[PDB]
Amino acid sequence: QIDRLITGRLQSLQTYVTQQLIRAAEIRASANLAATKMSECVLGQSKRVD
C-alpha cells in the first residue's frame, strides 16, 4: 500500500517538476526578450519596427 502511495506521489512530483521546467523555459524566453528590450529600447534608440 505504501508502494502504491509512493509511486503515485512520485508521479505527481515528476509531473510538477516537468511542467515547472517547461514554464521555466517559457519565462527564460520572456526574460531574454525583456533583456533585449532593456538593451535596445532603454539604452538606445531602435530602428526595429514595433
Partner 1 sequence: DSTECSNLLLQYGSFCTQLNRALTGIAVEQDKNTQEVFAQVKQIYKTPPIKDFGGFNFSQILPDPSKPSKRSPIEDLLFNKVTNGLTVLPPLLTDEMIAQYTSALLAGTITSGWTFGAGP
Q: Which residues bind partner 1 (CB under 8 A)?
A: 2-3, 5-6, 8, 10, 12-15, 17, 19-21, 24, 27-28, 31-32, 34-35, 38-39, 42-45, 50
Q: Under the criterion CB under 8 A, does residue 2 sit at the interface with its own copies?
A: no
Q: Which three cell numbers stand for residue 41?
A: 529600447
Q: Which does 46 bind (CB under 5 to 8 A by kind): partner 1, its own copies, none?
A: its own copies
Q: Which residue has the cell 533585449?
A: 36
Q: Which three cell numbers stand for residue 44?
A: 538606445
Residues 13-42 that bind its own copies (CB under 8 A): 14-15, 18-19, 21-22, 25-26, 28-29, 32, 39-40
Q: Which residue has the cell 517559457?
A: 26
What are the respective helix, strand and coil percentages of the chain, to the nearest 5?
80, 0, 20
